[PDB]
Symmetry: C2
Subunit: 148 residues, 2 copies
Amino acid sequence: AVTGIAFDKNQARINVRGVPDKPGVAYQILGAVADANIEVDMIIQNGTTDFSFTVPRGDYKQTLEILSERQDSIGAASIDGDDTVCKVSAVGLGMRSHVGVAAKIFRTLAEEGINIQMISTSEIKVSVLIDEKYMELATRVLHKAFNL
Amino acid sequence: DDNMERAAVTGIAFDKNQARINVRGVPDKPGVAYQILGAVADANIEVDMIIQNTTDFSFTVPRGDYKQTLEILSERQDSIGAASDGDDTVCKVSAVGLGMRSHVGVAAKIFRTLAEEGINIQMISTSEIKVSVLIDEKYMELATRVLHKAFNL
Ligand SMILES: [Ca+2]
Ligand SMILES: [Ca+2]
């Protein structure tokens, strides 16, 4: 089911707030980001809507400046971010089958009172964005929770 | 951008066998999110696209398990801090990211195509490993055609 726990501090969250819910919006945000050729990892979305995504920590300032200038188009209420988050992953080949992973990791991080900001799942991995100060804790909590 | 070709699973999946649950009105006192999902996982329902953008939880379930999820979360809704709705006319579009050098070109494209046809993205949920979105099931054939065209299948 779950064979390893990975973690990675090279993360920055970026938020685009209260953007009109029309087609083409997502593209506008990302396309801007992808022509500065910065990689983007997680993306999360939803008469308004909110668009959160992750950027390698080193691209935090540029991304905010790319969106600051394209805030005209897009037309967002606010643009903020967080460069003190990190990603922690439950990883294991042979997994999609086992269903209570999202739940279990939520449950276990909940006990330690550590807020999950974002989640993404797949056959191969399940990942959460949390504040960096929880990284070790979360890794250890989860590592325990899955018997190594 | 050769990335779609590099994908190991080169393609876009369309799943009309899905339904969106929106658990509305949730307070921020102890691990309430778990009672939500553990209740769904105990019934052995598989879950995907968990979002929390003072804030609500939203997710997807195979369509054949919607009438059950709704009820499992219904008779536990005044046991969990819960004010309120689901949606069983959604279709999930997804591409798998393992193998791709970059994943953002593909995602921005996927978004651009749907935009050009006036198809609105209901929910996004993507990472290095999978790029997935939610659109209205009425656009499924249209989405398949324009997306197949855009990535040459
Ligand atoms: Ca800072
Ligand atoms: Ca912090």
